[PDB]
Amino acid sequence: LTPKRNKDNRNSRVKKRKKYQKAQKKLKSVRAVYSGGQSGVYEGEKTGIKKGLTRSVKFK
């Protein structure tokens, strides 16, 4: 009478492979991650430009 368990829990290595992929997909949400620079032609910002938001750390 066991609960249904996880194929990813059946290997200790694959679980940390797939909770690190989840973590570094969440890291793109909190920060802005340097992906590697300009790939091809500069197409544009592809997601929008906000002219009201300033995401910069003010001093004191």
Partner 1 sequence: DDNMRREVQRDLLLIKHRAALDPKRHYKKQRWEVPERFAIGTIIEDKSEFYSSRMNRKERKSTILETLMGDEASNKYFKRKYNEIQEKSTSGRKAHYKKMKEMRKKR
Partner 2 sequence: AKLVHDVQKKQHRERSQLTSRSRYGFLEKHKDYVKRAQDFHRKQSTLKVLREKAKERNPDEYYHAMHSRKTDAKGLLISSRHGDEEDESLSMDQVKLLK
Partner 3 sequence: GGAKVVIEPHRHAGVYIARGKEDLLVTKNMAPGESVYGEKRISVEEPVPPTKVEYRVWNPFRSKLAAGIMGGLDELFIAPGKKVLYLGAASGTSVSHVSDVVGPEGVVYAVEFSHRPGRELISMAKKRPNIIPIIEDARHPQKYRMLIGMVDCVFADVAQPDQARIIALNSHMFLKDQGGVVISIKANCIDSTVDAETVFAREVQKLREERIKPLEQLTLEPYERDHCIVVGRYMRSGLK
Partner RNA sequence: CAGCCGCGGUAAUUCCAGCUCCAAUAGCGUAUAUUAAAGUUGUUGCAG
φ, ψ at 59 (rounded to 5°): -85, 145
Residue 53 within binding range of partner 3, rule CB under 8 A: yes
Q: How many residues does the chain have?
A: 60
Residue 48 within binding range of partner 1, rule CB under 8 A: yes
Q: Closest CB to RNA among 22 and 28?
A: 22
Residue 58 interacts with, from RNA, partner 1, partner 2, none (CB under 5-8 Å by kind): none
φ, ψ at 28 (rounded to 5°): -65, -20
| Rounded least distance, CB 18 to partner 3, Å | 25
Residue 4 DSSP label: P
